[PDB]
Motif scaffolding. Structure first.
Motif, short mmCIF file in Angstrom:
data_model
loop_
_atom_site.label_atom_id
_atom_site.label_comp_id
_atom_site.label_asym_id
_atom_site.label_seq_id
_atom_site.Cartn_x
_atom_site.Cartn_y
_atom_site.Cartn_z
N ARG A 60 -7.08 4.24 -10.06
CA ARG A 60 -8.31 3.89 -10.75
C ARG A 60 -9.23 3.39 -9.42
O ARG A 60 -10.18 4.18 -9.00
CB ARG A 60 -8.28 2.79 -11.41
N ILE A 61 -8.87 2.47 -8.76
CA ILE A 61 -9.73 1.84 -7.94
C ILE A 61 -8.97 1.84 -6.38
O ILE A 61 -8.07 1.12 -6.30
CB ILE A 61 -10.34 0.53 -8.05
N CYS A 62 -9.59 2.43 -5.43
CA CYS A 62 -8.84 2.50 -4.10
C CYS A 62 -9.38 1.78 -2.96
O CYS A 62 -10.86 1.57 -3.14
CB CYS A 62 -8.46 3.92 -3.52
N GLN A 63 -8.83 0.91 -2.11
CA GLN A 63 -9.25 0.24 -1.30
C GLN A 63 -9.22 0.81 0.35
O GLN A 63 -8.50 1.83 0.48
CB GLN A 63 -8.73 -1.12 -1.18
N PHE A 64 -9.96 0.30 1.34
CA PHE A 64 -9.88 0.82 2.56
C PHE A 64 -9.04 -0.13 3.41
O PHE A 64 -9.68 -1.17 4.01
CB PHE A 64 -11.13 1.14 3.01
N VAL A 65 -7.83 0.13 3.66
CA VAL A 65 -6.90 -0.85 4.37
C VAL A 65 -7.14 -0.42 6.04
O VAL A 65 -6.52 0.69 6.40
CB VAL A 65 -5.33 -1.11 4.16
N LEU A 66 -7.54 -1.34 6.88
CA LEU A 66 -7.49 -0.79 8.42
C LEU A 66 -6.68 -1.98 9.15
O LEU A 66 -7.17 -3.02 9.01
CB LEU A 66 -9.06 -0.62 8.85
N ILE A 67 -6.13 -1.57 10.34
CA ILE A 67 -5.48 -2.53 10.95
C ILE A 67 -4.99 -1.82 12.46
O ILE A 67 -4.72 -0.69 12.52
CB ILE A 67 -4.27 -3.03 10.53
N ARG A 68 -5.53 -2.44 13.71
CA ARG A 68 -5.31 -2.04 14.61
C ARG A 68 -4.54 -3.03 15.64
O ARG A 68 -4.86 -4.36 15.69
CB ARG A 68 -6.65 -1.73 15.53
N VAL A 69 -3.55 -2.46 16.75
CA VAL A 69 -2.89 -3.50 17.47
C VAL A 69 -2.76 -2.83 18.82
O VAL A 69 -2.12 -2.14 19.21
CB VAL A 69 -1.34 -3.59 16.78
N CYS A 70 -3.49 -3.74 19.64
CA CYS A 70 -3.37 -3.51 21.29
C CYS A 70 -3.65 -4.72 21.97
O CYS A 70 -4.53 -5.33 21.84
CB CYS A 70 -4.53 -2.22 21.34
N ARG A 71 -2.68 -4.81 22.90
CA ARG A 71 -2.70 -5.86 23.78
C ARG A 71 -1.84 -5.73 25.05
O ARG A 71 -0.88 -5.04 25.07
CB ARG A 71 -2.14 -7.30 22.90
#
Lengths: 12, 12, 12, 12
Positions: C1-12
């Motif tokens: 039905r409804i989709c979301q936009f999952v975003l995640i970044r890992v840099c250190r």
């Protein structure tokens, strides 16, 4: 401790 | 009708 | 039905 | 040293 960047958008 | 953004850091 | 936009970044 | 990005949609 390491932190992450959690970002999410919701538009419909 | 939705349209927003939510992002937060997670210090592990 | 409804989709979301999952975003995640890992840099250190 | 880490550095990577990952984002995916979640269709509910």
């Amino acid at each position: 401790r390491i932190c992450q960047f959690v970002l999410i958008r919701v538009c419909r």
